[PDB]
Amino acid sequence: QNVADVSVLQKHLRKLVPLLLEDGGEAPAALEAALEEKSALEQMRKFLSDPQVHTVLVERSTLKEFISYNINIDIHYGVKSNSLAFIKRTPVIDADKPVSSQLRVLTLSEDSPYETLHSFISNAVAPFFKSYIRMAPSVEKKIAELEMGLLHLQQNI
Amino acid sequence: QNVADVSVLQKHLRKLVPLLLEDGGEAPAALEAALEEKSALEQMRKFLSDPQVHTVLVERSTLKEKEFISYNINIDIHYGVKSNSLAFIKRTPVIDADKPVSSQLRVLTLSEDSPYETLHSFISNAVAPFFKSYIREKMAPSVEKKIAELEMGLLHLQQNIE
Amino acid sequence: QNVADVSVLQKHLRKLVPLLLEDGGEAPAALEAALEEKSALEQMRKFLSDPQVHTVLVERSTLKEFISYNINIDIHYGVKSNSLAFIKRTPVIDADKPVSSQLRVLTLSEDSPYETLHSFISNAVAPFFKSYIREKMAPSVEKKIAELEMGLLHLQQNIE
Amino acid sequence: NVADVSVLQKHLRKLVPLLLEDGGEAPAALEAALEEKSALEQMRKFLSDPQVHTVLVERSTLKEFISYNINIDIHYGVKSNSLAFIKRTPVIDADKPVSSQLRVLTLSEDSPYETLHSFISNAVAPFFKSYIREMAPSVEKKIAELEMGLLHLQQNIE
Numbered sequence A: 001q002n003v004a005d006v007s008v009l010q011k012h013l014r015k016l017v018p019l020l021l022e023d024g025g026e027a028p029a030a031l032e033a034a035l036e037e038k039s040a041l042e043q044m045r046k047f048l049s050d051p052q053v054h055t056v057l058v059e060r061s062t063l064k065e066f067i068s069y070n071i072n073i074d075i076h077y078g079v080k081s082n083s084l085a086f087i088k089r090t091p092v093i094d095a096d097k098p099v100s101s102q103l104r105v106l107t108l109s110e111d112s113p114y115e116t117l118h119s120f121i122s123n124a125v126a127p128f129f130k131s132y133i134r135m136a137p138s139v140e141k142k143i144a145e146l147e148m149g150l151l152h153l154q155q156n157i
Numbered sequence B: 001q002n003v004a005d006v007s008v009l010q011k012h013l014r015k016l017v018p019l020l021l022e023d024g025g026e027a028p029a030a031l032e033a034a035l036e037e038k039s040a041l042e043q044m045r046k047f048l049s050d051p052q053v054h055t056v057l058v059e060r061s062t063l064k065e066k067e068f069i070s071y072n073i074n075i076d077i078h079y080g081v082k083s084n085s086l087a088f089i090k091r092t093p094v095i096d097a098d099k100p101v102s103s104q105l106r107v108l109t110l111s112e113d114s115p116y117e118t119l120h121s122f123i124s125n126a127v128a129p130f131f132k133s134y135i136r137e138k139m140a141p142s143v144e145k146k147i148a149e150l151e152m153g154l155l156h157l158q159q160n161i162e
Numbered sequence C: 001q002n003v004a005d006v007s008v009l010q011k012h013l014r015k016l017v018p019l020l021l022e023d024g025g026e027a028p029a030a031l032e033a034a035l036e037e038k039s040a041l042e043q044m045r046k047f048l049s050d051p052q053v054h055t056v057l058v059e060r061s062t063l064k065e066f067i068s069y070n071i072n073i074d075i076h077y078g079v080k081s082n083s084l085a086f087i088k089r090t091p092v093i094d095a096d097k098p099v100s101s102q103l104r105v106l107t108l109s110e111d112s113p114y115e116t117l118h119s120f121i122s123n124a125v126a127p128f129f130k131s132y133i134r135e136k137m138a139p140s141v142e143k144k145i146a147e148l149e150m151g152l153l154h155l156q157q158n159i160e
Numbered sequence D: 001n002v003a004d005v006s007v008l009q010k011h012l013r014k015l016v017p018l019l020l021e022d023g024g025e026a027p028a029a030l031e032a033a034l035e036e037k038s039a040l041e042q043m044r045k046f047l048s049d050p051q052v053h054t055v056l057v058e059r060s061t062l063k064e065f066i067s068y069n070i071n072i073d074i075h076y077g078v079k080s081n082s083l084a085f086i087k088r089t090p091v092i093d094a095d096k097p098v099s100s101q102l103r104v105l106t107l108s109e110d111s112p113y114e115t116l117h118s119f120i121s122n123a124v125a126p127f128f129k130s131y132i133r134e135m136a137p138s139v140e141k142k143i144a145e146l147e148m149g150l151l152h153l154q155q156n157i158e
Ligand SMILES: [Ca+2]
Pocket: A037, A069, A070, A071
């Protein structure tokens, strides 16, 4: 019935972002600028309310010193960007349940995407899948093949 | 080369865990007990200093008694049926004392939902678009297909138990 | 040939822990959480099945009135921990015999370890050993027990 | 406020069957032992007298007829399996749980050299090391010597 208000996501990000993309301390003015952009507000409302929108990215960018943030639905890489991605666990974010129990969180660094994805596949997805299953064998093998593929791309820079 | 002290990871977890595995508030007593276990101190120390240990899992479990909450910290990444977890993966072989801890870790949450669904969601909603976003701007198109096959495979696995 | 299932050990601890580490009553929820950890299941399985693992420790810790349990193979002291140590009598715990006949049990308190050990040596080990030998290296071992007892007594006295 | 003898009896009625029997209720043999006059006096002493440190509950079999006996004296018997209780403080207080005030050690019918070797090697030595890692080195070495002494005594009769 009740979709969470945008302010619930803003408040959550003011607390979470400083822990994951900064060295602690309070939410920087730069992050507050991003949370208040009209575009950002509409992207965040869409994420909260629309079952077809699954993700939101908080991206911290530096230029040569100068820190900037941006909020958008699109999950992507940037050479001088470090990001936090939120994935909804259910189609809509319920105003009546805690927000943290409705999201999955992943961080995405400025490393080569081949390295970052290799690391997530090799160190998290592969053992988590094996832990459960120990078509399933065919999916275990595809995880292994994806891991190798990514390792090759990473080695071939 | 100076390795970060285990207190650096404890302090970080005290702040982060409540935002990700609880509904905010202070670090619960159950978490502090898990952070002070001798076994956990050992596991955390290996994570900080041993290039061969890539990961650490903070696992929050619930038991029916009304619910009893327990935490446990260990290197092994696994699923639990009434467990919601935070996994840390190191970006480099050792965690350096002289840089912020948050800059040296990758974080992923792992819920109590069916792992087929959890993994489908990470592959479909993060791994796929992150990869495609990068290659758009020769193994590469074959890895893109492999991600699509993995995605579909996890989708079918979930569908089969719904 | 048949190794006892981890559930045999869980059941035994559910009954025993409340009498030795609590004031009776039912197995606390804190103990049940410790008993179902994956790390704990693996440690307990290794204790039951592997000749090179001799012990398992059930450790009760207090924080701040907040009680936590943890199960692990390693025998150690903790400043606000009271523990129950099980030592196997044989290399492998046999499924076909009662579990209690296959274990030795020792409790290890939150007291200074000098005092705890002094007490076990002077009140149990010494008189047990003497009872047996009285009923060529044996007098030499008796002397070693007395030296150890003395040494532990002095270590405790030094921090009093 | 010193503990009454019934506090120790009740505790033994619950503990003994877990440690010296295969569970079940306290056998009549244990109840007979807890009501002997000699046992009652010894238990009373244990509770109240600073110079009595220990009490043993000893389970004996005769070819199987089961017998129990409670006495202060800690000793081995070839047909006996025992539970030893050691007081942590000079007297046992009624106002605190009795379990918090005792140390417990089981003592089996195995060769005493083997039982003692096992306690020293698997409990005392790592417990002491864990502490002195977090005169002490001389005691660590005496532990190792005792361990070795017991090992050799057991090997010699194998
Ligand atoms: Ca912007």
